[PDB]
Amino acid sequence: IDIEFPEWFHEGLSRHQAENLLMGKDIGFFIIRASQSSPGDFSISVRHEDDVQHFKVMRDTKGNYFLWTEKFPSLNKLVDYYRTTSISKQKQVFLRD
């Protein structure tokens, strides 16, 4: 099998710990963590210019993953799309490593 989660996947990081980690980084650095306020969701924490913002990973009954309109077969394909299409609709923010 594959076992190992992707490098940016940190199941047990709280929203606050994700903020503290990402405030040290540039725009677009990000992590994926299991959700706190909704057990059973995942969240994506992303450095913006002045703070860290959070996105809810959406799903449908076919198992697709999405944030907005475009849908993906996997979390990895979602993350990949947001490297070159802005994950923010108010400012331009691209996921980066």
Partner: peptide, 6 residues
């Protein structure tokens, strides 16, 4: 809690 896309 708030999320951008919710």
């Amino acid at each position: 809690r708030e999320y951008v896309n919710v």
